[PDB]
Symmetry: none
Subunit: 193 residues, 2 copies
């Protein structure tokens, strides 16, 4: 007779960037080999994360949750592009809980997991462009600005196509990501006389 609830392993470093789909897995095991269902909540209260979704593939099937082959629950979602980021990054997160139960109805305690979220510039780190030679380092021409932007773009296919690259009069590059966070490339990585 099964009187023992499932056990749940959560990922330690769920880090999501605004506006960009994330995914992670829960792993659930039960001594019976079978997990019936799970529930995501805020310590038992409503989850309150309508942009998060998880798959219920293979729920409630014998053998779906053994020590060797745990039930691997795919969770995905997109933190809103305009999600405010608190000044203290330790509060830029969502703390939530998961519980799970077996076919006998033994329910686990609430297990904590944390979704940290960050501005897109915390993900992206622009690579060096090929240097653009300019006539005046203090007053780039329109052609030179075009060349700088093209070189930054060619070096950074990994940056969203939707980010906008601007170039100031002295060759300083600003990259503005879709979520309005930014990176800067100092002119000395960009232009030479």
């Amino acid at each position: 007779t099964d009187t023992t609830p499932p056990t749940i392993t959560v990922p330690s470093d769920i880090i999501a960037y605004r506006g960009e789909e994330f995914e992670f897995y829960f792993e659930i095991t039960d001594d019976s080999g079978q997990v019936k269902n799970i529930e995501l909540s805020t310590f038992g209260k409503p989850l309150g994360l309508n942009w998060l979704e998880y798959s219920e593939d293979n729920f409630n099937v014998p053998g779906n949750a053994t020590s060797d082959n745990p039930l691997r629950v795919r969770v995905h979602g997109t933190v809103p592009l305009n999600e405010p980021i608190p000044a203290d990054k330790n509060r830029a997160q969502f703390t939530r809980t998961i519980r799970a139960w077996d076919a006998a109805g033994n329910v686990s305690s609430n297990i904590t997991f944390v979704i940290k979220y960050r501005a897109q510039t915390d993900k992206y780190n622009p690579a060096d462009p090929t240097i653009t030679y300019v006539d005046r380092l203090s007053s780039l021409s329109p052609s030179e600005k075009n060349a700088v932007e093209a070189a930054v773009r060619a070096a950074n296919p990994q940056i969203p196509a939707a980010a906008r690259i601007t170039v100031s009069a002295n060759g300083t590059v600003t990259i503005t990501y879709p979520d309005s966070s930014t990176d800067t490339i100092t002119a000395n990585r960009v232009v030479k006389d």
Copy 2:
């Protein structure tokens, strides 16, 4: 038959030479001589130095018999690029250089200097941007980075004739600036560039 050539060459000048800063241009002088041969030319400022180091011409076929007949005149190709930064005064018509040309035949006769005028203008005078296909945006007063990219691409697509070296910028409200290589500009007002997505869907 007169014993000697005493008649200098005759030069025809182009009447409407118009150059845009930063863009190569060319024009032709046509020269004939009663002997059929023109030895060389001089471009000057009424006999003083030309003072236009960006003006060039080929001496191909100079001083060859038969190079300068009525049926087959000497065609002198003059070409160059007015500097990107050449100053254009408040009166755009003052943006011109009046210079002189003369030519020698092979008998020592040199024509008297005649004038020609190189007018030069800003590039925005040459280029007239077509309006882009409308970009639909969420906030007319604050375009997103992808909306500014989209506007720029639309302006670029609607204007293949504009130079690739022109830089297209987009303001917060979708006002477009096209800055040509010589830093002259054209503007497209926001109401011809962007429209609110919700109002229009």
